[PDB]
Amino acid sequence: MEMEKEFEQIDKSGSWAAIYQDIRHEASDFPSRVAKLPKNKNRNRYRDVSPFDHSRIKLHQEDNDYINASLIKMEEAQRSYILTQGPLPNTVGHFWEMVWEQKSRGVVMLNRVMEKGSLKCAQYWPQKEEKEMIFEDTNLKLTLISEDIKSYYTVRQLELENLTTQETREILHFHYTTWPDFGVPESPASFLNFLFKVRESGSLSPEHGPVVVHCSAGIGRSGTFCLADTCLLLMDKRKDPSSVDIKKVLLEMRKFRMGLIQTADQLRFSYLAVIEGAKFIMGD
Ligand SMILES: O=C(Nc1ccccc1)N1C[C@H](O)[C@@H]2C[C@H]1CC[C@@H]2O
């Protein structure tokens, strides 16, 4: 079926939970043996969220190459994403090692450091220009260059230096600051505006390594971001945009990381975002 009318048909019939459970039943199951090794317990935020072995990002280190991060490679859309958990106190150096080694231009953050009164990820970037951060375990230096605070999101320019080679690179930090502690946003308008700002920066384009996107577990909000982006790109590429099937795209993405889209409310919100986004693209 088309999307917008499939949407109203699920609303009128109140069957979002059943649609979402079907997706959960059909989703791929691949091994995640490296994630479960005892030496990696303090590298995982949640025991039930792990990268598959076949798609995990490997650190360029011979001691321990593990990070909780996955490469989502979308062949028809010609887009790739790295989805990862919010960094932990003992993985902030690994996180920036990955950004460096994978040649990423941008980092997309969809959570606040504290939500619901608890810490959802480490404070992994510097908050003042004159107070830079050094990660001694991976030999990197990170400096805040500029910060632009808007009503729904903040964009930061960061300098990452590989202290071993003295090479430097400019990284863009896109921080969506207004996702509610509970539920999903009422309107997708600010989330779509944010997606378009990431796109306009070059961070999603083939001349760079894959964008790094995270929330707390790296599957819920993060899944919504890449699902909406890929669906909108396919609607622009194809002769028949009504042929884009958001459930089929989600199942393809779940071949590369488990659990993408965590609730039926996140599934409905993803539909809403793609539907509204397709009107603004055109041509309108
Ligand atoms: O480092 C950059 N881009 C980049 C490329 C690849 C991977 C990660 C980052 N920058 C962008 C552009 O090249 C120059 C240099 C630097 C800083 C800003 C200036 O526009």
UniProtKB/Swiss-Prot annotation:
Organ and tissue specificity:
Expressed in keratinocytes (at protein level).
PTM sites of type Phosphoserine: 50, 242-243
The terms under GO molecular function for this entry are: cadherin binding; enzyme binding; ephrin receptor binding; insulin receptor binding; non-membrane spanning protein tyrosine phosphatase activity; protein kinase binding; protein phosphatase 2A binding; protein tyrosine phosphatase activity
Membrane topology label? Peripheral membrane protein
Residues annotated as carrying S-nitrosocysteine in the record are 215
Q: Which reaction does it catalyse?
A: O-phospho-L-tyrosyl-[protein] + H2O = L-tyrosyl-[protein] + phosphate
- Cross-link (N,N-(cysteine-1,S-diyl)serine (Cys-Ser)) at residue(s): 215-216
Could you tell me where this protein is found in the cell? Endoplasmic reticulum membrane
Query: Changing residue 215 to S: reported impact?
Result: Catalytically inactive mutant; abolishes sulfhydration
In this chain, substrate is annotated as bound at: 181, 215-221, 262
Name the Enzyme Commission number(s) assigned to this protein. Answer: 3.1.3.48
Query: Which residues are annotated as modified residue N-acetylmethionine in the UniProt record?
Result: 1
Q: What does this protein do?
A: Tyrosine-protein phosphatase which acts as a regulator of endoplasmic reticulum unfolded protein response. Mediates dephosphorylation of EIF2AK3/PERK; inactivating the protein kinase activity of EIF2AK3/PERK. May play an important role in CKII- and p60c-src-induced signal transduction cascades. May regulate the EFNA5-EPHA3 signaling pathway which modulates cell reorganization and cell-cell repulsion. May also regulate the hepatocyte growth factor receptor signaling pathway through dephosphorylation of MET.
Family that this chain belongs to? Belongs to the protein-tyrosine phosphatase family. Non-receptor class 1 subfamily.
Protein name per the record = Tyrosine-protein phosphatase non-receptor type 1
What organism is listed for this UniProt entry?
Homo sapiens
Query: Which start and end residues of the full protein are shown?
Result: 1 to 284 of 435
